[model samples]
Target chain A: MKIGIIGAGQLARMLSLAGTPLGLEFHCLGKNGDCAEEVVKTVTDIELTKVNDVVAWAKQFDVITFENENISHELIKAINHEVSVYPSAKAIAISQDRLLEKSFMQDHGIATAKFVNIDSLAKLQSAVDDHGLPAILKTRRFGYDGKGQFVIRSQEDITKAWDVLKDAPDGLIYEAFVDFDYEVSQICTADLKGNIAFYPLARNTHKQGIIVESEAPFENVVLAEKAQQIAKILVKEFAYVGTLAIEFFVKGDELIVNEIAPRVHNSGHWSIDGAVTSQFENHVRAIAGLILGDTTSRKTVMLNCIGGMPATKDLAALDRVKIHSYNKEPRKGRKVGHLNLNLNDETDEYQLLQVKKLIALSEEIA
Target chain B: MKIGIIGAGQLARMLSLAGTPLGLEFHCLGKNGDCAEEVVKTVTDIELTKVNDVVAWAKQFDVITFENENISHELIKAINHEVSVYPSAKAIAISQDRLLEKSFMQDHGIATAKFVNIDSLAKLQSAVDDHGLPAILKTRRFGYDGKGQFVIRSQEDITKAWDVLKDAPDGLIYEAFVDFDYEVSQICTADLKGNIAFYPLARNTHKQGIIVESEAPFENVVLAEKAQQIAKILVKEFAYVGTLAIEFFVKGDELIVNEIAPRVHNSGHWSIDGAVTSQFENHVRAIAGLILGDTTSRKTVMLNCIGGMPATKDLAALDRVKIHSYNKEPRKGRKVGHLNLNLNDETDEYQLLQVKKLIALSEEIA
Candidate 1:
């Protein structure tokens, strides 16, 4: 069967690799960029901004999904209703809006930090008064990796945040600052039948809000289960038929929702080697209406090699690590590649020590 | 470094797959009808009968080797004297001739069945009288898989055998049959530095001279060690810098040389799933001057799905059995696909039984 993807990025590249052996043809709809086009076949470099172009491309594929949530909803809807779209356009619309996502999580009885809508200066002042000075003001849509957001520490920070977001109407959300002890991400897949399977929680560490390391199956089972339950509920609500990634903040025993990515997220890169089946393969299976792949853990640990830090040869040292290098022109903050290390089923201390040593050596050499 | 292969079959196809991820380029020189042309990136179709055409194609690659032993000695010599040809033209000439191969093995202190060369009708009659009427007559060259040979059961069979091979000017060899307990193949790689590492000996079973099943790591230390030693000696004699397969017939404490394939043989197919490194990958490493990969076994069983008797999907029942269909046209005696099943450690008897049942079902259904 033929499958189509909206964005031609690494996600599409990985999907194509997984789908090819299973006799599936993949078509990508977007400009040929530095990601999926490097690995995948049948990519069309078309102007996706034009609705008619996207609709015409959509007609040629048997099924469609998006790598990113930036596509126009009207264009997606214009395609036949019979055509399968995973993580539905409605789910994308809700998750893309920060205010709507947070409120929806709260309404569904899922744990999330308290937040208030911030459209006008008067509303922003009221939210600041109640939530206190230390709050995060984020734009409602299309913001990622710390872009289109600000930290309001004082009255001075609030004015700067207001000026930066003034062009957007009904654009801001003021959330209470969460002082969680640890951050984890749960990558889960749900079929159309509401059956959900979650990969181990990836313990996340961010460098300037960009994820650098996401080690799998972190020590906190209680918090991870909570995150998984929240993910299941979200996917069930949307009747989602593909992979979904949800970030969580753990404060002691309590788990709070951080954000939701409606498509396969970067934190699940550990699945490439650690799990019996990778997230990319599972996504393809889910989309193809086949049984979801086995998600059993073979081992753990994944290091996101950001920028062009580690040369190709040095990254090959980790025994079971699978390297995925995006052929993008290296810039300061670009995600040039990632290294996934599958630790042997030995002592956790030994595995963690090895991971620490690899990270240190990779960074030092760079 | 770029490596070139003379034959484009399954061996070349597998080498290409393994080389792609390592940033290694592999070129195959053969006619377009060869299997590797469809799967490998670098292939140039050429007439094997023309020596100059072969040499012209060899110049494009840095180092060259043959995927099959069928290439003419003239072609091998033409390429070898100009550039590097692995296993050497001398090795190919000796191995390609059955009589020369057996004589070399015997001269090198390798054990084999007793045999005599018969050039004329009088010599054939004398050999039959000496070795008895039940002796086997085999042609000196261009014979494989029980072809170009016949068993002489009685006086009447000798005339039939003579009629079958009388046109061959090189004459024939008559040998007394040596009964053996089982058959095994040792796939080994010898580097330019004389370092040899042998993959686990795979116990083989054949029906009508076609390999049906192979179980790796025979678990008999004496037998395994003997196989390894024989492989090392054979490769060292050839000064082979690529993967070689040596077949042996074991009876109690004695090991007899049966035959040798100068490339990756069917018995090594289990390496794709059972070992840390596949034979195909090791072949590439040897030719490219890279460190040879690990040959440690992790519990593997390979079943050759001959012809189109077994449908591809039926082989997928076992979780570890990776079905590899060659995408070739199915015929009565053609090898269409193979299945490699790997268990991480010692597997349960029930699992093995389940695999056997699946195999039987596939055979019956297809």
Candidate 2:
């Protein structure tokens, strides 16, 4: 079968890699020099902003899936009109807007942090006054990797946050600052037949609001079940198809939902080497209407390459380090590649030491 | 780094699939509609016999590797002069001819069945008379998958066998048939620096002399070590810089070398999902001069799909089964794809039963 990806970034690149072995063909609607275009058989370099062009390009595929959640609702709907679209238009819309994502979780009885919508400076001031200090003011839509956000550290900071975020046409929401002990994400796939397969909860470590490292199967049975239960509710609620990832902040025993990714996620990259089947392959299976493969996790640690990559030779030379380069040039803070380390033993002293070395390499200027 | 594959068959397709994650780019020089063309960035459809054309096309790549072993000596020499060619010309030459391959093994003290060069009917008759009744006659070069061979059962059949093989341009060899207990393959990779990594020996099952199924980590330490020792000798002997697979005929405790594949072999396909690092990725790593990844084997059973493929959805639904389809059409005796089943338990009742089902499906026309 022929598959089409909306954006040809690393996620799409991995999806192509996973899907090709299933006798599936791929065409990417991507820009020139797209990482995924190298692996896919065909890539149409067309403006994603032009609805007609994207819709026309997407028509030939047996099914369509997007790598990013930021695609506009109208564009998704237009493509869906011509062919099947996974994660549906509604799923994209709910995920694209943080307000909708949180509200959707709440409506489904999923736990999320306390928050209130803020549209104006007066509203932001009032909400801050009611909620107290140490909150985060964020644009309701088009925010990712801690971008399009402002921290309300004190009463005086509210006005400054408003000045910076007021230009966001999609309005804003002020969320109570969650003093989370640690962050974890639950990723699951729901096929067209409504069968869901969930991966283990992955504990995440973030740097500068970006995910730098993640370890899977955190081994908390209670928390894993709780995350799976929350994910089940969301999957049915969104009538979700393909992979859905939910980031959660674990404070004490309570699990608070952080956000949702409507596609294959970075936190699950370790699945490529650490799971019975990879998250990318599972996503392709779900979208292609095939039954999901096994999701058993092997002890794995994943480190993201931020800014620039270490030497491929050096990383590859390391024992158990599986390098996945995005084939993209590194700019400051750009995710050029990642390394997956599968642990055969229980101790992670080796993994910890390598992480330090990896971080140092990632900070290098190419 | 860019890699050029000499043939865009299933092996090249898998190499492309494996190398892409390491940020390696690929271009395959192959015939039109080659299976690998689907996954590579570029595929130049050209005749392989034209040395100049193949050489010109190969110049663009930093390194070159071939899928098939049948390329002429002149063609390989031409390409090697312009770009780095893996499996070295000498290794290819040794593997391309059965006589050279057997002689090299014997010279290295690796055991093999009795054999003698046959130039005519008189030589074949005399050799068969000396070697006794159940002997086989085979062409010395360009033979694969039980082709270019004829069996002799008795004195009357010697002339018949000679008649069938006399037309072979490279001449032939008559050998005593080996009544083996089972078959296994030892696959290893050696980097430019001569560092080597070996995978566990995989017990293989064949039908009509074509590999149909294989299971790895046969778990016999003695045989595994012996095989590794033999492979180490061959690797150092050939100065091999890529994956080398040697098929062995096991009779009791004696391991008689059957043949050597200069590139990745069918028996190693299980490594894709059943090992710490796949053979294809290791081949890429070796050629790229990167240190090898781990070769630890997870309990895995690989079933080759001959003639046709089973339903992808059905096989994927089965727990722990990883499907790898080559995207080739069904023709009688064709290897279209394969399925890998990872075993969590020591027993293979599930694997055996599924193998029956897979074999049944493989015989069906799509």
Candidate 3:
């Protein structure tokens, strides 16, 4: 099968890696020097920003998926007319705007932070007057990794948030910030027939608005059930046919939906070694109209290598650690690689030591 | 580092697959349409049969390895002069000729069947007269998969065996055939510093002289220890770097040395998913002068799909099975793909059912 991926980035690179074992051929649409170009041989020389160029390339593949959710929905719709597009253009459209995504959650009875669309300083001030202080102001589109967001801790910050994001291409929104305990994400895959499977929730840790660590099979029965229920609601609503990730904010016994990613996600990368089937492979299977793979998670801890990478030899020398380098040049805040540590036994004493070592290595470059 | 692999067959393809995650760049030296070309870009135009052509390509790589043992030792030696070659030309030289291989084993006090070199029909008849009637005759070089071999059952067959194989490029050898219980192989990897790690022994099944199935972590403490000891002797004797596999014939409590593969062997394919570190990745690490990966096995059973493939979707739908396709066209006796079934629990009843399902799937295409 010829699989075309729109972004030559790490996610697409990993998707191709996982798909290769299944006899799926991948051609990435991006210019030279992209991280995925290291593995994908046929990288079509098309600018992702150019809709016409991307639409033409999408026509040749049997199926298409994009690593970047920031892609225009019109472009995705145009490509959908040419080939099978997983997660659908409508799903991407909803995810591209925070207002639409939150509203969909609300309509589906999924729990999320109370939110309202805001277009101008007046509306932003009005939202604060009603929603109160200690909220978050965010652009509705093209935001990720804590970008296009402002934390409104006091009344004075309302105008500052608007001035910073007033030119957001698709306007902005105001959301009541929930005082959360920690974060978790549920990765779910659904087939064309609506058969669904979910990986165990991963407890996530963030630093400076970027996910720095995640551990799989988080021990929470009630929370896990709730997350899966929310995922099923979205999957049924979208009729989703690939991997979908829903990030959640856990406060006390309650779970609030933070956001949804319409493709394979970073939090699920541990599945490459720690699960029976990786999220990347399951996503490929889902989009290919194949049976969904098992998503049972074993004990695994993931640490991201940001900015730069530790020595490959040094990292691999750590027992039971699997090293994955993106082959990208080091730049500040860039996700250059990641390490997955698989544990046969997740005793607190043993796991703490391993996590410390992984953190030390990650901090060296991060 | 730019690693160049020769043969561009399945081994090269898998090596490239395993190395990509570690940020290694691979350029295979083979013609177009070779199986490894499916994943590896930049396949240098080089003919394996031509020593000069291969020698020129070898100089461009930081290190070199070949998937096929049939490559002339002189060519490997020429390449070694230009760059590093794993398993060394000396190891390849010994593995290529049965006489040298057996002599090395005998010199190292490894157990083997009684054998004698034969050049003509008279020598063959004389050897059979002394050795016994039920014996095997084989070409000393350029033989695999039950090829270049004949059985001398009675006096009438000695002349026939000579007639068929007497023109063998390196003459021939006649050996006493052992009635063995089963076959097992130990795959070991050694680094430049002489640190060695061994995968649990794999019990292998053969059909028409080709390996059709393998299961790892064969449960016999005595046999596993013996296999590891034998592997250590070979690794030390050869001063080997990279993955080396030694096949053994088990007779009661004794293990008779069958043969040695200087590169990754078919029997070790189970380690790709069953073990913490795969033979392919370890081989690349060894050649690259990096630390060896963990070789702990995790109860994996491998089935080779010969001649054709079962429906990829169907095989993937099997619980806990990983599908690996070589993307090769079907041909009689050719290996087109394989499936790895990972068992979380090893109860006899549960395993029996899963094995039957794998066998059913394998036979559908085999």
Candidate 4:
């Protein structure tokens, strides 16, 4: 069978790589100027005026998937009318907008950090006043990483925060700055029959709003169960039929929903070497109508090599380290590669500290 | 760094795949009309005039290696003079012919079966008469997987054996058949500095003289050590660099040499899923002058899917199975793909038995 993927980025490249053994062919869809699609065996360059531009092109493949959710769900639904697509348009639609994601989760009784829609400067100032002094202002759509966000510490800082995100053009969302004990993500996959598979909770750390490192089998047993419950609730509620990952704020054993990703997340990268079945493979299987694989992991840590790569010689000298470098030019603060480290024990504090020191001291990597 | 592989076959593809993460570039030196060069980033389609045709072309890469030792030592040495090459021409030359391989091993105090060279029909008759009936006559060079060999059982079979291989241009080498208990292979990798790493011995079973299955950590504690000693002797004797595998006939407690392969062997395929480091990655590391990784197994079995592949759905249903399909048309007796099975002490016994039966009953495969 053949699978068509939208957006020619690192994520799309990884999905094709993971599908190799499954005997699935991949076609890349990108704009004419997109350089990443140059290597794709089957490629279609279109204006992307509407998702229907690919209606006929996608018909040749068994199904279609996307590397990013930046496209409209209406466009996704149009594609679905002709060919099957995973992570249904409904799920993508909800995640594409901040307001919809928070509203949907809250309506389902999932605990989330308080949030309010801010249409203008008056609304933005009042929302922060009603919530608290210290808060985070986020654009309702198209904001990612640490972009299009500002911190509002006090009433006097309202104009400054508004100026920071005035170019968003999609309005703004104000949220409480929840002080969390740790950040963890629960990755789950749902099949057509509503069967669900859960990966071990991954404790995560962010550097400048992007994932820097992730450790699997995150220590707190209570937090893991709570996170899994929230993830399961979201999956079933959305009727998701592909991989879904939701981040949580662990505060005193209580889980507060942060945000959800409609596809594979960076935290799950460790599963490539640490788990019996990788998140990418399972996602492919889930969408391809096959049985999911084992998602358990031994002690493992995944470190992202942002902007630059770590010295290959030094990395090679380490025991049980698997490095995966993407075929892309290294741009400042861009993800060039990553490394997975297998640990002797899930709670091996000594080795964990050593690796932590190594990553911290590797200044060559951004 | 970049690597130049002399053949654009599955082995070269796999080596490139393994080295992608180590920040290495791969260029395939193949003849025109070679389909595999499509994926090799740097493709050099040469005339393949003599074995020395690659000499100048290979100088552009950091080092050159062969997917298989099909080229002569004279050619390898010619290429070596311009750039670096792994395993050296000496090792490949000794392994090219069976008589030379056995003699080299014997001169280094390695134990092997009785054998003699056959030139004319008279020499074949006397050699069998001297070594007795239960012996095998084979072409001294380019014979593999039960091909180009005749089994002489009695005096009357001499004419039949002569009729079987009278057209062999490379002449023939005769060997006395030893009553072997089982077959095992020891895989090793040597670096430029003479440092080495080894994978655990694999218990192998052959069907039609082509490997059907191989299981890691072949339990005989005594036999593993003896086979390792023999392998180390050959490695040091030939000044070998890169990966090397030696097959053995386990007779009672002593190990008798069956044959030596200058490159990675099918028996070590289990290392990809069984060991902490695979033979492929270690071979790349060895030639790159990097540190070796830990070699250990976790009760793994690798089965070659020769001739044809089983249904992907059924294969996916098997627990802890990793399928690797070589994108090639199915041809009888050709290795089209392979899979690895992971076994744990929990339910391994019953699952192992079921998988063993499935592999045995799948007659469409090799």
Candidate 5:
């Protein structure tokens, strides 16, 4: 079966890789002159802005999906009318805007952290007064991976936050801080027939706003089930037919939706080695009307190799972690590569601690 | 570090896939328009023909190896003089010729079936007279997967065998058939420093001379250790720096060397799912001057999706068997895909019996 995916970043590259072994053909619609163009095995690059061009190109594929939720609604509408498009364009419209997404969750009776929209400096001040300092200020649209977001620690930081996000329309939302003990992500898939399955919740640790390490289903069964239920409800509401990730904030008995990614997210990267079927594979499977794969996590930990360049010795030192390096030129704060370490619960945690130490050592060397 | 492989078949393709997680850069020197040319993400294809061409390509890579033993000695010699070629050209040359390989094994005190070489009909007659009517005849060079060999069950078969093998100048080997219980294969990677690590012995079953199933080491301590010792000695002698397979025939306490593939063999395909480090990844690591990866086997059982296309339901019936279908057009005797069923020892053997029954059920579907 032929599958066309919009946006040819690492996500598209990974989807293509996963689909190949299962007799699925992949065509990637990339922005012109993208790095994914160089690989040129399964991907067919196309401009995102040209709707007619994309529609014409996608005509050859049996199904259509996106790697990012930023695809134009008009394009999605045209394609949905022509061929099958998963996670309806309307869903993208809602999820793309943080206010709409949070409101949708509220309407669906899904638990979420308290948040209010700020349309002006006065409104922002009112939100700060209500929510207090140390709250998160985020743009409603086009924000990702810590971009277009800031924290208001004090009154002095409000001017800087406004200056940084002044380009966004109106004001940003000041979300109340949740004193969660842990952060977890659930990668779930829904098929055309509404059959849904969830990969294990990935317990995450972030450093400098980038995901540092993730262990799968470490604990908190109740919270994990809650996250899965929320994800299922969200997918059903969207009529989704592909992979989506839901991030959760857990504190005591409560599990709140932190955010949702309408496409395959970084937290699900562990599925490449941990699960019987990778999230990318199952996403393609769902769109192709095939059986969804088993979502069993086989004792895996995913570590983001965050930095310019990690030293070879440090990478070599982790005997258990499977190192995956992106062949990109080094840049500070860029996700250059990742390491997925598969270990059982009985495995010595000292080895994991040693791997963390080695990662630090590699950073020092770089 | 860059590493170059001589052939680009399934071994190269799988190696490429496994190496991606380890951050190894791999280039394959394939016959123009080979199957591996289409494998994205990991394998980069180059032309392979003359010694000068190989040497020129070798200059760009830090180390060189072969995916198949069919590589010519002249090409290997040219590359070895300029750069490092693992498992030495001499070892490949000997392994490529059945007579020399058998002799080498015998000289090194490795047990093998009784056999005699025949260049003429008189020599063939004499060998037949000595070994009796039911003997196997095989050419000295370029034989694999039951090709370039013939079995004579009676006196009437001698003329046909002679007619078929007349093209062989170095003639054939007539061997007494042994009452072997089962077939097993051992894969190992030896470092330049002569340290060898063997993957668990995989018990294999073949149908029409094509491997159909491979099961990991199943508590046969005596047989397993003996196979490991034999593989270590062979690889260490060649100073093999990449993965290679040794096919053995076990009859009670005696383990006989049936054949040796100086590269990754089909029976070792289970390593992709079963082992901590796949043979492909370890092979690339060995050639790249990196430390070898872990060879621990997880719960894995691999079955070849041989000859014909099986329906989805037939494949899905097997518990936890991840099916991988090659996107090749189906043909008689073609290897289309494979399925890996992960199971604990506690799993009911009756369930596997049902799986076999289901596989048979799908045989007539297409």
Candidate 6:
């Protein structure tokens, strides 16, 4: 079986790595030097601006998926015409826009933060007045890793925010600031046959809005089941095929839906070593119509090594620190690679304590 | 670090797969159509005549290895002059010839089967007379998977065997038949700094001299440790910088050395799914001067999908059945791919039962 990936990021690279074992071929739509091209047997370097070229390339593949949500929804729809695109274009469209995603969540009876759209300065003030101060003004689409977001702490900040974001082509969104305890992500996957598999809930800890680390089986079953239920509703609502990771704000036990990623997610990176089957493998299997593998956790933790890898040879040499370098040159705050510290059969606070020690060692040096 | 592999067969392919997660790049030396080239970043097609061209490519990599022992020992020596090659030219040379390998093993006080060299018709008759009628005649070099061998059970069989193998380039070898209960293999590794690790002994069963399936952690610690001792002797003798697998024939508790594979052997295929780190991974790590990963067994069973993969979907659907297809066209008696069933954390007989059932299913269908 063959699968095509729309983006050539580390996720796509991992997708190829996962699928290659099962005799699956990957046809990547990206540049020659993209990380995924190294793992794939063939790469169709598509000039993204030329719709005709992208259309022609999409025709060569019968089934396709993506690693990034930044891709144009129109392009996804166009590709969908020629190929059976999974995690459907409509779901992608909803995910690509913060407003549409939030609205879709609320429409499905999923609880989310209080928010309203902002077009003019008056509407921005109206949203601020209604949702209250200290909310965030965000772009509706193409915003990732804290980009295209403006914190509206007071009334004075809204003018500059609108001035800067008024010309945003993908439009703009304003969200009420969510006050909660530790945030977590539910990495859920489903197929056309309604066979859904949920990876253990991952407690996500972001450093300056970028996910730097995550731990799975996050010691909260009630919250995890609730998150799973929310995910099931979304998956069925979107007719989702493949992984749909929904991040939630876990305030005590009550969960508030934040946003949905309609693809294999970073939180699920732990699944590569922690679970019986990795998320990348399950995503490919779901899309390829293959039987899903076991998703049982193997007591592992994933530490996202950002900016650069730790220079210490000891950390690199550790057997459990399974380094998965993306073959990418490190830049400040960029995800270069990740390390999975498989805890063997050991569980509970002791394992998490070891994870904390390693994280500190990596962060202090890196 | 970058590594160069001489052959672009499935071993090199697997080597690439194993090392890619470590951010290691493989530069395969073979034709464009070679299977290993698909996994590697670069392929340097060597003409084998121009030593200078091969040397130029060899210089591009700091370390080099090989998948097959059939590679010209002279070429390895030439490559070694430009770059460091592991499982050294000394090891490869000895492994290539039955006589030299046997002599080296005997010189090291390692037990091997009684054998004699056969050249002329008189020597053939003399060897048969000396070793007895039931002795087997094997070619000295370039033989694998039941090829280049003949069984001389009676006087009439000697003429047919000699006629078939008379023009053997590496000469001929004769072995006295021994009554052995079963066969097993030990996969071991050693680094330049004397660090060594051994996988659990693999209980092997072959069909017509071709290894069809293997089970790991073969019970009986006495024989297992003895096998490890024999392997350590050979590895230390070679000062082996990578995986060294040696097969053994056992008569009750006593073992007779069969032959040693200088690189990762087929018997170690279970490591891909069963061990913390696979033999292929350790080979790359040892050569690259990286710290070795864990070699602890996960209670694995390996089924060599010889000739073709099982057509039944049940085998593929099994969650624990980790299929690794070599992406080759099916040929009778060819190793197209393999399936590794990882019995993680399941130590007892029920795990063995699952392995047996799956193996039986694959064998019955294939």
TM-score of chain B of each: 0.92, 0.96, 0.94, 0.94, 0.90, 0.93
Colliding residue pairs in candidate 1: none
Best by lDDT: 2
Candidate 6 at B5: error in angstroms?
1.0
Provide the lDDT at B211 for model 6.
Answer: 90
Count of clashing residue pairs in every prediction: 0, 0, 0, 0, 0, 0
DockQ of each: 0.21, 0.81, 0.68, 0.49, 0.45, 0.55
- Give me the candidate number with maximum DockQ: 2
User: Candidate 3's residue-wise lDDT over A213-289, tens digit each?
Assistant: 88998889999999989988888888788999999999987999999999999998888988888999899988888
User: Candidate 6: where is the Cα deviation over 4 Å?
Assistant: A311-313, A345-366, B311-314, B344-366
Error of 6 at A270 (Å): 0.9
Over B242-338, each residue of candidate 1 has an lDDT whose tens digit, in order, gives 8888888889967898888877789898887576567877777677666666566766778776655344334333334454655555665577667
Single out the weakest 10-residue window by summed lDDT for candidate 1 chain B.
Answer: B311-320
Tell how far residue B61 is off in model 5, in angstroms. 2.9
**CA shift of A195, model 6, Å:** 0.9
Candidate 4 clashes between residue pairs 3 or more apart in a chain or in different chains: none
Residue A255 of model 2 has an lDDT of 93
Task: Report the C-alpha lDDT of model 6 over B264-360, residue by residue, as the tens digit.
Answer: 9999999988887899988888888887887767777887876666642454467656768887767767787888776555543454465456555
Tell me the TM-score for chain B of model 2.
0.96
Report lDDT (Cα) of residue A149, candidate 5.
94
- Find the candidate with the highest TM-score and give its number: 2
Arranged by TM-score, best first? 2, 3, 6, 4, 5, 1
Provide the lDDT at B45 for model 3: 72
Q: In candidate 2 chain A, where is summed lDDT lowest over 10 consecutive residues?
A: A346-355
Candidate 4 CAPRI grade: medium
Each model's TM-score? Answer: 0.82, 0.97, 0.96, 0.94, 0.93, 0.94
Could you give candidate 3's fraction of true interface contacts?
Answer: 0.66
Candidate 5's C-alpha runs over 4 A off are A31-40, A169-171, A345-348, A363-366, B31-33, B41-49, B312-319, B345-366
Q: What is the TM-score of chain A in candidate 4?
A: 0.92
lDDT of 1 at A54: 72
Which residue pairs show backbone clashes in model 3?
Answer: none
